[PDB]
Symmetry: C3
Subunit: 282 residues, 3 copies
């Protein structure tokens, strides 16, 4: 009737006893890249983030540990601190995830488009994800559609949030709201296929912005506030129907996917100007 999960554990034996390291690259995210790695015993393939090892990261990971305990958050599995070059390293090993940057995955649906109801599902989940962190006092601070990846390529295959190179524990407008901001950011693009455009006004083109419930077009408002305050807290955010919906959302045809195919070329812009938009945002 009473339970916990294990504490975080820094193994010190050269991961090389415990795994076999490829060089086959994966993510080339923040600090160090991401390497295919296979667990010797099990023989399963794995993400490996390489870290300099300094209190910062050393905590950043420290939180991740707690966070992984989440469904929609990427789970860490083992965290060795060894010695690569000549400097006390830090290798955090986590479930690899081959589903792809959420969006990039949708724009190859081809057969059948996307649905406002299916768009929910995505956003819907993302919500939960954020909650947890906040709901324990962590703010992610970088919620890019780069860092929303899927597990497998099987269509049921769920998606998760990663790269804790940014987050903080919300201790003692605030912090845990950029995370909101982004969700907002996310939804927009999730429907048309672009964000706003400042560094202002965000317009609503015909062929996509239509009978598409102005009701939804409401929420997004409270979400997007260039304000810090009044940007609808996640705690808040969850409550609203569309979120807790699953099934009553408009069956609308979503151009979103193909919207992107239409001018796939301007995204390295989008995808990235977002980090610009983000990160720097305090």
């Amino acid at each position: 009737q009473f339970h916990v999960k294990s504490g975080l554990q820094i193994k010190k034996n050269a991961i090389i006893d415990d795994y076999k390291v490829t060089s086959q690259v994966l993510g080339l995210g923040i600090n160090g890249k991401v390497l295919q790695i296979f667990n010797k015993r099990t023989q399963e393939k794995f993400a490996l983030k390489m870290l300099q090892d300094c209190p910062k990261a050393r905590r950043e990971v420290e939180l991740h540990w707690r966070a992984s305990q989440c469904p929609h958050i990427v789970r860490i599995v083992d965290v060795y601190e060894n010695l690569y070059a000549g400097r006390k390293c830090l290798l955090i090993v986590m479930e690899c995830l081959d589903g792809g940057e959420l969006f990039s995955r949708i724009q190859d649906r081809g057969d059948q488009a996307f649905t406002e109801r299916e768009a929910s599902e995505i956003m819907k989940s993302i919500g939960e994800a954020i909650q947890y962190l906040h709901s324990i006092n962590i703010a992610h601070r970088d919620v890019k559609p780069e860092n929303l990846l899927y597990t497998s390529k099987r269509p049921n295959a769920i998606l998760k949030l990663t790269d804790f190179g940014f987050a903080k524990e919300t201790t003692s407008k605030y912090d845990k709201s950029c995370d909101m901001w982004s969700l907002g950011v996310i939804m927009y693009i999730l429907l048309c296929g672009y964000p706003p455009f400042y560094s202002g006004q965000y317009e609503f083109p015909n062929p996509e912005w239509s009978e598409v419930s102005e009701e939804v077009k409401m929420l997004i408002r409270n979400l997007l506030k260039t304000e810090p305050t009044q940007r609808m807290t996640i705690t808040e955010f969850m409550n609203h129907p569309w979120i807790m919906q699953s099934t009553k959302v408009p069956q609308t045809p979503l151009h979103t996917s193909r919207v992107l195919k239409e001018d796939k070329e301007r995204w390295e812009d989008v995808k990235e100007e977002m980090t610009s938009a983000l990160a720097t945002m305090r």
Copy 2:
């Protein structure tokens, strides 16, 4: 010809592999309560203090470890840092102790009263206890007759000091003296059955304060000084006869026990105003 004891060790595997946790409560002291807990292998019952886990506690315990190495100080046995709620916990497991808040144990002697010579024994011991901590540079800072408990209910069964939620290492009037103060505090009540009463003068009623060696009534003085300086250091405190006595102290009948029975009702006052008196005292 050369020796040590082991270092402190933070196990990280969910204590749930290593113990079976009840919910049967015990102490409801400082932070977290105290739970009956049984060691799987041995199958012995145990105290478990639950801690938030922040440098403070995380050190407070850290000292306790060293301290336990003492007879009259409660011994820690294992200290897991896991994850309860959503926050890196800290579970320190120690020998449970069912003898009771020193005093509360005496006021049920009934058959035969207490003896100035037997009162020594108690105080006598408590002294040692303090020494150690100080004698390694730790000040306890909370020495309540709540935190002086006995092991078993068998009359030989000794007593020990606990709850390190307060102490410090005396590094670099001072600090390690409140601990004195309290011993003082303790002895008084240990004889009549009350403390002073300020927030001043401490009087000496007939039916108890009597042929009871004014000699003892001396020491207590040097102990009680509302001063910081000149409150007889423990190092000092030990030297005096009555302490190193065991056997020459007056065989006096002590009302103390029954003294308390006489107005048991005002104690929640006593017992507690002491923490008030204490703690806050710097």
Copy 3:
């Protein structure tokens, strides 16, 4: 095709399970002495440095770990943090080394003297040693001919650098140059058999300072600069011929060894005034 070494590991089980401790003293260096110690399993003899255990040391060692990964640097093998007296100790165990304070070892060659070419070898090596530390951003800060010891007494038997009670990681004239300074210091004495003498001018007596390539007498210059800047960095220092030489250096007879025999008595002065000279030097 990809590799590391293991991370540093603080064992906590009383070393007394893992080794048998003598009392036979060895080094009486910085903090704690040096004890013969034998590894239970292997049954090999070992150095043991005893440390108070405070962040400082606790890091000082922490670096040593990385450093040991070096040939010419003394290797640490195990680092227990236990409880001696009453205070969280720290016992770092390393390969013992019975070859002797570099110099002291040379002044008993007797049969055949020393060679400028053989003097290189020594200095030559020492160079490398320093490089590493610096080459990973550690400055040793104490490079005395006390801390340059040999492994065995067999003449091939190499020598290594020890006592990290002083060093720092060179993070963010500078720091990692005292180490240079000393090398300089070392070479001089390595040839005549004294240093300079200030607290100034360093002269060059006949019977030793002779056809002995003024070319070498050059380098030493750039090394010795009472300056902080322009004291030839090690990175630099290495490049020059004499260093990378091994074999083209003058076959000169070196009085050095016997030079010391000649007035062995003034050395406790030399050997030590060096620490004076050193250490304090910022």
